[PDB]
Amino acid sequence: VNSFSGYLKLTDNVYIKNADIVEEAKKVKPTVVVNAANVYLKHGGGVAGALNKATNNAMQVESDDYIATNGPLKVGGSCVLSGHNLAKHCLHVVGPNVNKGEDIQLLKSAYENFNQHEVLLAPLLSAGIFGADPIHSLRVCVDTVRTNVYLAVFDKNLYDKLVSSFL
Ligand SMILES: Nc1nccc2ccccc12
């Protein structure tokens, strides 16, 4: 049993809700919240900008030190950093950004990072300002992630379309 409430069950392991990931993270304090990161961990906008704002910029400060030591992530890659006030850990995952011309086949590689964590609160990778089709992102998620994932979808309209169209 876990703390997640109000989710619709899509599969054995994937759950979805129309919810604010920050507001959801603040309520649940999950072991892992996933960030929709870029390779530079520059948390300007979208999910990343919202998560970072909720940490009062502490996520960005930590991320800048990570990059100064390790250099950029790979598209499809990830790193584990602090969850600050939102979670124990933040798994920063880089999905391909279609608005930069990145290979959408890298979306499966991105989701494979989730399999290193038994339970996660996450957004749909490569959705929103990353430019991919969220219906496609949900399909790749279901077909790739084997651990228990609780997806937060900010937009109610999109939430209802994802559920109605789910095979
Ligand atoms: N805040 C938040 N929560 C879940 C999904 C999102 C997608 C895009 C921007 C913000 C989001």
Nearest to 123 by CA among 131, 112, 134: 134
Testing ligand 1's pocket by substitution, the residue of 86, 93, 154 carrying the most ligand atoms inside 8 A of its CB is 154
Write b or e for each residue in 45-60: b if 16 or more Cβ atoms lie within 10 A of its Cβ, otherwise e.
ebbbbbbbebbeeebb
Kindly tell me the number of DSSP H helices and DSSP E strands found in the chain.
6, 7
Query: At what resolution in Å was this solved?
Result: 1.0
Atom of ligand 1 nearest to the CA of 21: 3
Q: Are 25 and 87 in contact (CB under 8 A)?
A: yes
Query: How many Cα neighbours within 13 Å face the side chain of 104?
Result: 13
Q: Are 67 and 41 in contact (CB under 8 A)?
A: yes
Q: Is 21 in the pocket of ligand 1 (CB under 6 A)?
A: yes
- Cα(50) to ligand 1 centroid in Å equals 8
End-to-end CA distance of the chain: give it in Å, rounded. 26
Q: Is 152 in the pocket of ligand 1 (CB under 6 A)?
A: yes
Burial of 149 (0-12, 13-18, 19+ CB in 10 A): buried
Strands (E) across 18-147 are located at: 32-36, 78-82, 89-93, 119-122
Residues in a beta bridge with 82: 89
- Cα(35) to ligand 1 centroid in Å equals 10
State the amino acid at position 43 in one-letter form.
H
At residue 35, the 3 state secondary structure works out as strand
